[PDB]
Design a protein around this ligand. Structure first.
Ligand SMILES: OC[C@@H]1[C@@H](O)[C@H](O)[C@H](O)c2nccn21
Ligand SMILES: [Br-]
Ligand SMILES: [Br-]
Ligand SMILES: [Br-]
Ligand SMILES: [Br-]
Ligand SMILES: [Br-]
Ligand SMILES: [Br-]
Ligand SMILES: [Br-]
Ligand SMILES: [Br-]
Ligand SMILES: [Br-]
Ligand SMILES: [Cl-]
Ligand SMILES: [Cl-]
Ligand SMILES: [Cl-]
Ligand SMILES: [Cl-]
Length: 835
């Protein structure tokens, strides 16, 4: 790209527990915990009872040192900057006897001029990480109250005083690992003349005919002379130049602001997953001085995203309009992929997005108790067509709002807004998670004096209704901001449900049946969820076999909600026979979470346009644990992920049965209307025999982006109560010429009420390496089958599906670990779980 040289400061690091004077190799980027693990100085934090055994680390200070060589020639570059992309958290950075920086914000990158401090030959970098605990003890002691951050698993809730990942202090699905270290990359850049400080591609307008852009550059010129330069912007697509623009300047010492207009005629639009291609242009900005001294590029998607949040007859709408078209949101809430962030590899990020794209998602919420994710994450969003709802990193508690804290947050907000604002995927900012809800409804007013309660309320506005929205207005002015999710709606207050987004925790915390999701509807569901134990191979990764009960102390260990086990059983008993064995119980819990949650995903799509989106809680896990996730820590899809994929299908046949009657809806998120369609249904018993005749509804239309009822029949006089216990409804949708475009299966009774016949799923297996093709067969219905393998991270073409009486079913299992010579397979189904 340009004449600069970058040195990656990523080898030869050592670390030491302060005071010990003992030093050992470290891996950077990394964490103090991981460095210790690598030297068997801590046990596997995720195993067994090890949480309590690793806590001591957070009471210690930790130092990091590296040496590097700089040549005479490098020292004669005009400028040299040391960039820290992340320091967790209170870090005194020393280079060659100079204190360059007192870092105090995990979420901030720092760029430091170092030429004048560097020496020819060897150079010594030394970082002192103050314990974030010991650092904030005195701050907590000055405060005279304890903030109500219940997810902070310590008597003193110190999390709130630090700009550090909230979940690192513990969460209701997470381990407490209050770590430190150089958590993103360290780079030393040697350069001439200037660097591009920021390159913002600002979209001014977009029509089918023309995209107008403003290319906004901040150049930091490091020499004392005035430098004539030419600024060049090349717009390209797939390696071919689309437009090129050019601007003569004379760069002054310090910051220069340069703006160059560019246009793209007949622009190829970036579209979300399901609606077309996630087209990305390449925008390259160069500073040319006679040599290209500086260059920076962004991949740019050309699209409009408008969040429509307006008063209406139903209350206040909350929806996303994309490229002019109201887009029903289908997705999940995302949390950190690990307790130790630098352990999340490029491959792990790629697989997560594959999992989202494959489940037909078009949106993800990066929830406020994690981090502002790394550049890769948003790059993957961009190229997978997934819209991104970005919370600022505040969750579930009120926070300080003193001048100095607000200054720190302002830096963090400016840094990440500029970092993220060029991404096609970025759709909106949200000030926090559930803080206004908490302040209003979680009983804080009986916990604090009236004066401190008032200070919390005034402090709320300072941060979330003044500082954050005004910063977004300044630096990202065409992006929506909302102060909180949920902004008004509260799950115990039906009158508030028509106003904006909902976290419906009536299911789970309120003990409400899954069927309540058909009647308790939001304008937009930004959270709802249900826990499940992960499958046995994940349990085995943290527990010995003597530990495989629900309430072993092990298992308790890996259940951070406190309530969760009894809720699971309470809900399971409503719909299923509770199995006697721990492993059968784990299996039925996976089925339960998949079935109840997908009934909600279905209600929300069915009730469009009243409801315009659904993001379940939660996509993923940070470690081996019992949680609300659809994918466990090892990347195994639970039933819920397969069920999310089905419920998010572009076209879906949705049968819904209430008050002894059946409706069938056809739901489409396609951009085109389907015409001359036939819905075909037939009642089949568990032995495979059709009851009565096929039912045909011909001449159906399925308009773009609609949910519509095409069929209703009462059960009474159609099927007897015994038929209902003994048969299912198969439903297929076909075009004019009889091509199948969709299919569903419907059961008339709760699973515990079904007269399931004893049966064996037999299978044939054809195994090559990387691969296992299974052909399954059962003469009778096998209900909710789980094809279970011991192979961590094995991917399946399908799983957690009903194998229909007599119907062959092909399933492909893939894994890099499958060898050309036989994969262990155990097939479970509902009837086996009880006598
Ligand atoms: O309890 C599970 C999850 C939390 O992990 C997370 O804070 C989320 O915002 C939420 N709201 C209600 C419950 N939940
Ligand atoms: Br410099
Ligand atoms: Br600099
Ligand atoms: Br200027
Ligand atoms: Br990174
Ligand atoms: Br108080
Ligand atoms: Br606001
Ligand atoms: Br137990
Ligand atoms: Br019913
Ligand atoms: Br069902
Ligand atoms: Cl261990
Ligand atoms: Cl940046
Ligand atoms: Cl139903
Ligand atoms: Cl059986």
């Amino acid at each position: 790209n340009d004449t600069s040289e970058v040195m990656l400061l990523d080898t030869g690091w050592e670390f030491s527990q302060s005071g010990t004077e003992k030093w050992m190799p470290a891996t950077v980027p990394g964490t103090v915990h991981q460095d210790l693990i690598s030297h068997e100085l801590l046990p596997n934090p995720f195993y067994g009872m090890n949480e309590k055994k690793i806590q001591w680390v957070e009471n210690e200070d930790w130092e990091y040192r590296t040496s590097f060589i700089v040549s005479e020639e490098q020292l004669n570059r005009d400028g040299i900057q040391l960039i820290f992309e992340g320091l967790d958290t209170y870090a005194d950075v020393y280079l060659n006897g100079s204190l360059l920086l007192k870092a105090d914000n995990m979420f901030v990158g720092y760029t430091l001029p170092v030429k004048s401090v560097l020496r020819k030959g060897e150079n010594h970098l030394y970082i002192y990480f103050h314990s974030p605990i010991r650092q904030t003890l005195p701050q907590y002691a000055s405060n005279g109250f304890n903030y109500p951050a219940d997810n902070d698993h310590h008597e003193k809730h110190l999390s709130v005083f630090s700009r550090k990942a909230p979940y690192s202090y513990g969460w209701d699905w997470g381990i407490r690992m209050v770590t430190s270290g150089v958590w993103r990359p360290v780079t030393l850049r040697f350069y001439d003349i200037a660097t591009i400080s920021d390159y913002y591609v600002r979209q001014l307008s977009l029509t089918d005919e023309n995209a107008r852009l403003s290319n906004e550059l901040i150049v930091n010129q490091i020499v004392p002379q005035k430098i004539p330069a030419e600024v060049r912007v090349n717009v390209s697509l797939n390696g071919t130049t689309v437009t090129e623009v050019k601007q003569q300047v004379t760069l002054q010492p310090g910051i220069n602001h340069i703006t160059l207009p560019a246009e793209v005629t007949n622009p190829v639009r970036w579209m979300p997953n399901g609606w077309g291609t996630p087209t990305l242009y390449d925008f390259s900005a160069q500073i040319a001085c006679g040599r290209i001294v500086a260059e920076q590029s962004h991949r740019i998607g050309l699209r409009t995203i408008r969040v429509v949040n307006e008063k209406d007859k139903d209350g206040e709408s909350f929806y996303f309009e994309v490229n002019g078209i109201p887009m029903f949101a289908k997705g999940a809430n995302y949390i950190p992929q690990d307790a130790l962030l630098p352990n999340v590899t490029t491959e792990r990020y790629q697989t997560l997005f594959r999992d989202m794209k494959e489940a037909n998602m078009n949106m993800v919420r990066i929830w406020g108790g994690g981090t502002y994710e790394n550049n890769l994450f948003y790059d993957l969003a961009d190229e997978n067509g997934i819209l991104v709802w970005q919370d600022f990193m505040f969750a579930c508690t009120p926070y300080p709002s003193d001048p100095t804290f607000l200054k720190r947050v302002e830096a963090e907000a400016v840094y990440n807004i500029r970092r993220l604002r060029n991404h096609a995927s970025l759709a909106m900012w949200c000030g926090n998670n559930e803080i206004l809800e908490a302040l209003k409804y979680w009983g804080f007013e009986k916990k604090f004096t009236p004066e401190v309660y008032q200070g919390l309320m005034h402090g709320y506005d300072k941060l979330f209704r003044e500082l954050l929205p005004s910063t977004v207005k300044e630096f990202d002015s065409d992006r929506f901001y909302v102060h909180s999710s949920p902004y008004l709606a509260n799950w115990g207050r039906p009158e508030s449900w028509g106003t904006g987004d909902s976290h419906n925790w009536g299911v789970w915390y309120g003990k409400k049946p899954f069927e309540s999701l058909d009647t308790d509807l939001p304008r937009f569901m930004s959270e709802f969820g249900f826990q499940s134990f992960p499958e046995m191979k994940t349990i085995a990764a943290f527990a010995a076999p003597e530990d495989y009960q629900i309430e072993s102390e092990v298992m308790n260990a890996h259940q951070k909600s406190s309530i969760g086990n009894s809720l699971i059983r309470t809900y399971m008993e409503r719909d299923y026979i509770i199995p006697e064995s721990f492993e059968d119980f784990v299996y039925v819990g996976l089925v339960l979470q998949g079935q109840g949650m997908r009934h909600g995903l279905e209600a929300h799509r069915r009730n469009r346009p009243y409801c315009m989106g659904t993001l379940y809680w939660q996509l993923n896990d940070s470690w081996p644990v019992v949680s609300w996730s659809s994918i466990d820590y090892y990347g195994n899809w639970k039933a819920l992920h397969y069920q999310a994929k089905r419920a998010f299908a572009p076209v879906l046949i949705n049968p819904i049965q209430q008050n002894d009657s059946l409706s069938v809806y056809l739901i489409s998120d396609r951009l085109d209307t389907m015409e001359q369609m036939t819905l075909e249904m037939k009642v089949v018993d568990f032995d495979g025999k059709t009851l009565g005749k096929k039912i045909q509804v011909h001449s159906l239309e399925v308009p773009a982006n609609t949910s519509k009822c095409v069929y209703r029949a009462k059960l009474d006089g159609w099927l007897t109560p015994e038929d209902c216990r003994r048969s299912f409804l198969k439903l297929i949708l076909k075009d004019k010429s009889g091509h199948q475009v969709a299919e569903s299966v419907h059961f008339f009774r709760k699973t515990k009420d079904l007269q399931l016949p004893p049966t064996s799923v037999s299978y044939q297996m054809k195994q090559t390496d990387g691969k296992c093709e299974l052909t399954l067969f059962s003469s009778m219905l096998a209900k909710d089958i789980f094809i279970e393998t011991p192979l961590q991270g094995a991917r399946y073409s399908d799983n957690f599906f009903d194998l229909l009486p007599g119907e062959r079913k092909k399933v492909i299992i893939t894994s890099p670990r499958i060898k050309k010579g036989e994969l262990p397979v155990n097939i479970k189904h509902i009837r086996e779980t009880y006598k």
